[PDB]
Every structure is written in structure tokens, then in C-alpha cells.
Specification:
The complex is a heterodimer of chains A (123) and B (272). Chain A is mainly alpha-helical and 123 residues long. Chain A has one domain: Lysozyme (Orthogonal Bundle). Helices cover 29% and strands 7% of the residues of chain A. In chain A, a hairpin with a 4-residue loop joins strand 2 and strand 3. The longest helix of chain A has 13 residues. Chain A is globular, with a radius of gyration of 14 Å. Chain B is an alpha/beta fold. Chain B has one domain: Spore Coat Polysaccharide Biosynthesis Protein SpsA, Chain A (Alpha-Beta Complex), CATH 3.90.550.10. The chains are: A mainly alpha (123), B alpha/beta (272). Bound molecules: 2-acetamido-2-deoxy-beta-D-glucopyranose and calcium ion (CA). The site of 2-acetamido-2-deoxy-beta-D-glucopyranose has 9 residues of chain B, from helix 5 and helix 6. Calcium ion (CA) binds next to helix 3 of chain A. Chain A: InterPro entries: Glyco_hydro_22, Glyco_hydro_22_CS, Lactalbumin, Lysozyme-like_dom_sf. Chain A: It is found in: Secreted. Chain A: One of its GO terms (molecular function) is calcium ion binding. Chain A: It holds the Pfam family Lys. Chain A: Belongs to the glycosyl hydrolase 22 family.
């Protein structure tokens, strides 16, 4: 599903401030990462990235194309293609703790300034 | 004849834009008898200071082109522009290169007429309000500011994709657009970066008059997300000097003059 910035912001609250990344920064990162499409699937040099957070099967989740993946998140990549964001968020937190925000290539170039526009005022 | 008024008296404002009824160019031509071979139109009632080349990057989207022509020709005539329509068709099977095709359109259009303004438009975007003028302004103009795709709003303030317009001087000033972006994404952000580096700001109409419809379509396997896009946009300040109008090379395979437009099929090479 193609979510809105506010739908996304409300769903990822538990991630706010984790590893020092705010909700504004995440709204910005997710728009440029998947266009807020929970079913996004992108290939990238022999590997596939899934969902809202574009979590890769290279190390993070297990896919049928690449079954011996480290599957660090301990989850099937298909669980990242639905609208229940709790496990997508749990896996993102593992990426943040282990690898850091730079796993998301959109962060530095697109989310280093003009963060206010990303605020959701809708309760 | 004297100068066309600042605002056209022919505008109707909001329009219904639907992609239901199939189009027939023969009919479009029938309805637009004033459009000359190659899709050129010049007002007869007044003199327009806007000599506009409208550049459409393109690859296998004829059904989209039909709708684009069906809606834009009447709009552009109402806007009282001295314009020409150019469809830059990418031959080959390499990933789609939107920016490079726009650069080719700039160079090729200039061979036909002394255009002073260039509108760069995706072939699937139709403006829903004719007060959203397809011409150039004192600063770079972003036109498709409220696309239905983004809920009829601007997705981010730095967004310069979709439909935009640059005067010839503005375009020249940034060394045109990058040629090195292959595949989907980031080339428009690179363009945005260029304008900013040259000290320009982005002019836009408000979100109401900027309402724009996007014809729907399935993913283009020939235009998948560019893996290098995020890195590339971080180096625009330096690369805009060596990648642009000044390094543009390509081969023209065919120039086709149809009654509603000029289609130029080109071979723009492969990822370097
Ligand atoms: C670096 C990148 O991917 N930028 C894309 C841009 O090319 C596109 O026009 C816009 C709307 O879809 O979304 C951005 O995220
Ligand atoms: Ca999920």
C-alpha cells in the first residue's frame, strides 16, 4: 500500500530517536527510500530490497532467491511486504544498531537539511 | 498585431482530465487545424514573447503520447504560446536516460527555431488547470507541483521532477542537464542541485492551479531504480562542470515530422 507521510510517521513512533534519528528524518528517508510503498521491491546488484524500509535479503531477511542469507533479522522477506509495520520497524532497529543510518543511502543527500517540511501535525 | 496580453483571455481554469475514451490523432488534428507540421503553433491574433520548445523524453509509450497531445495542444494554444512539440525517443535497450534525452531535445529544437524557453515534460503528466502556464519565468519554473500521485501536493520542497521550464539562459547557465544518470531516479534532484549552485531559486504556481494528472502504468523494467543515484547527487557541484551540454554526444537515427509533433529517435549510447 502507498501510505501517506502522516500514516508512516504515526506507525514508526517506537523508532523515534533510536540511534539519534528523529521522526522527521525518517519521514524524509522513507519517502526517498520506497516512496512510502509498503510493497516496494527493488533489485540492487544480485540482491533484493523489500518494503517501506527497503530491507535487503543480502544480510537481513531470508528470501527464496537467496536462502542462505545471514537473515540477521530472523524473518522472511515477505513479512516486509504487508501493512503491519511492527516487524519492519524491529528489523530497521537492528540495522540501526548494527550498521547505522547510512544503510539508508537517501539519508545524507536528501535528509540533511529542510527537515521541518517532514513534520506530521495530524494527531 | 501587438503583444499578447500578460494573461490570456482564453483560459477556462480547472478542467476534467480522464483517460477513458480512446484517442484518435486524426481527430486531434481535426480539432487543432492551426497546428502546423511538426507540431508548431504561433498565434495569429497577437505576438507572443514566449517561443517555447516542449521536450518530452520517450520510449514505447505511444498510448501516453496520444493523451498528452489530445489535452496539451488545446491548452497550449489557449495559453497563447509560440511553441513546438518534440518527442525524444530513446532507441536501444539500455536503461532509460530521462535527463540526457531532455538535453538532446534542447539541442535539436534549437535547429528549428530560435526558442527562448524550454519546457521539459514527462509524457504521462497532464495539467488540470490552464492557468498553469507552460512557459518560462525569471527563475526556473517547476510546473507539476501537485500531481495526483503525491496526493495533489509537492512531495518535498526540493522536488523538480515531472514538468519544468527553463529559459535558454537558465539552462545554459547550469551547463544543461546531466548525461550520466541511467535508470530511474535522482537526475531531477541533480538538476535541482545545479540551479541552486548557480544561485537560482525555484518558482512555482500554487497547489490549486498546479494540479496535475499522471496517466497510470506498470513498472518499466527498462527503467529500474539507479543503484548509483544517491551517490551521484552528492557530487553535482563538481560533476555539473564536466557532465552536461558540453559533453553531450548522441546519434540521430530519425527525425519524423508528424502533424502534431516532431519525433526524434536517437542512440544516446550506454552507461559509461
Ligand atoms: C534520488 C531519488 O531517487 N530521487 C527521486 C526523484 O528522482 C523522483 O522524481 C521523486 C518522485 O518520485 O522521488 C525521489 O525520491
Ligand atoms: Ca510487516
Amino acid at each position: 500500500t502507498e501510505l501517506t507521510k502522516c500514516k508512516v510517521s504515526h506507525a514508526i513512533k517506537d523508532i523515534d530517536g533510536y540511534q539519534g534519528i528523529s521522526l522527521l528524518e525518517w519521514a524524509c528517508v522513507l519517502f526517498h527510500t520506497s516512496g512510502y510503498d509498503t510493497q516496494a521491491v527493488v533489485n540492487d546488484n544480485g540482491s533484493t530490497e523489500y518494503g517501506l524500509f527497503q530491507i535487503s535479503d543480502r544480510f537481513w531477511c531470508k528470501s527464496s532467491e537467496f536462502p542462505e542469507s545471514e537473515n540477521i533479522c530472523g524473518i522472511s522477506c515477505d513479512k516486509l511486504l504487508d501493512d503491519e509495520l511492527d516487524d519492519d520497524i524491529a528489523c530497521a532497529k537492528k540495522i540501526l544498531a548494527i550498521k547505522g543510518i547510512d544503510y539508508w543511502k537517501a539519508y545524507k543527500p536528501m535528509c540533511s537539511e529542510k527537515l521541518e517540511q517532514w513534520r506530521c501535525e495530524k494527531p | 498585431l501587438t503583444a499578447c496580453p500578460e494573461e490570456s483571455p482564453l483560459l477556462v481554469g480547472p478542467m476534467l482530465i480522464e483517460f477513458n475514451i480512446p484517442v484518435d490523432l486524426k481527430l486531434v488534428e481535426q480539432q487543432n487545424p492551426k497546428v502546423k507540421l511538426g507540431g508548431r503553433y504561433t498565434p495569429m491574433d497577437c505576438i507572443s514573447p514566449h517561443k517555447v520548445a516542449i521536450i518530452i523524453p520517450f520510449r514505447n509509450r505511444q498510448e501516453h503520447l496520444k493523451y498528452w497531445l489530445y489535452y496539451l495542444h488545446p491548452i497550449l494554444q489557449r495559453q497563447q504560446l509560440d511553441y513546438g512539440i518534440y518527442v525524444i525517443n530513446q532507441a536501444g535497450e539500455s536503461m532509460f536516460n530521462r535527463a540526457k534525452l531532455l538535453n538532446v531535445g534542447f539541442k535539436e529544437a534549437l535547429k528549428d527555431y530560435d526558442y527562448n524557453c524550454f519546457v521539459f515534460s514527462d509524457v504521462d503528466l497532464i495539467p488540470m488547470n490552464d492557468h498553469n502556464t507552460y512557459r518560462c519565468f525569471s527563475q526556473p519554473r517547476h510546473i507539476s507541483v501537485a500531481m495526483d500521485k503525491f496526493g495533489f501536493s509537492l512531495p518535498y520542497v526540493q522536488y523538480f521532477g515531472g514538468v519544468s521550464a527553463l529559459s535558454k539562459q537558465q539552462f545554459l547557465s547550469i551547463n544543461g542537464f546531466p548525461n550520466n544518470y541511467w535508470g530511474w531516479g535522482g537526475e531531477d534532484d541533480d538538476i535541482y542541485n545545479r540551479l541552486a549552485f548557480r544561485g537560482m531559486s525555484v518558482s512555482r504556481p500554487n497547489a490549486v492551479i498546479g494540479k496535475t494528472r499522471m496517466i497510470r502504468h506498470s513498472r518499466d523494467k527498462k527503467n529500474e531504480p539507479n543503484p548509483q543515484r544517491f551517490d551521484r547527487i552528492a557530487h553535482t557541484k563538481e560533476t555539473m562542470l564536466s557532465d552536461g551540454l558540453n559533453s553531450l554526444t548522441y546519434m540521430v537515427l530519425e527525425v519524423q515530422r508528424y502533424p502534431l509533433y516532431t519525433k526524434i529517435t536517437v542512440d544516446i549510447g550506454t552507461p559509461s
